[PDB]
């Protein structure tokens with residue numbers, strides 16, 4: 001199909017990279033795993049803001065937490081219900097953080113999704129946050145020279 005995955009998009013994790021310089025802070029990179037999770041083709045989602053993942057049972061207070069982190073240029077970790085292209089629900093243990101350049105300016109945002117079947121707590125929450133934060137750090141390394 002269109003937009004063959006780059007090497008970075010073949011990293012075996014669900015993530016996207018957005019460019020806040022572009023209209024509506026849209027996706028510019030999306031991993032193959034993210035596409036498999038969400039059922040979209042890459043062409044379908046490039047240039048779009050990630051809010052298409054939200055639907056009727058998505059808690060809007062949790063979306064506001066993400067909105068506020070983006071506008072304060074700071075990280076956040078939350079859990080919220082998201083939807084695939086066909087309307088299948090999944091829980092998303094979600095981590096966002098900015099990627100800074102060598103002047104400390106925000107160049108991209110990185111978002112990492114750990115899909116699950118339930119809201120998690122305790123050990124499953126801790127292990128999931130470990131995984132998505134480590135992944136975000138790895139994508140920070142991977143995306144620094146893009």
Ligand SMILES: Cc1cc2nc3c(=O)[nH]c(=O)nc-3n(C[C@H](O)[C@H](O)[C@H](O)COP(=O)(O)O)c2cc1C
Pocket residue numbers: 016017018025049050051053054063066067070080082092094096109110111112113
């Ligand atoms: C890098 C990045 C990744 C995002 N990933 C998700 C996601 O997995 N799920 C989601 O519901 N929102 C995600 N968002 C949040 C939305 O794109 C958007 O910021 C949120 O809906 C608040 O803005 P709005 O009020 O204009 O919709 C992501 C945002 C960014 C910048």
Ligand SMILES: [Ca+2]
Pocket residue numbers: 090115116117
């Ligand atoms: Ca799942």
Ligand SMILES: [Cl-]
Pocket residue numbers: 119120121122123124125
């Ligand atoms: Cl749990």
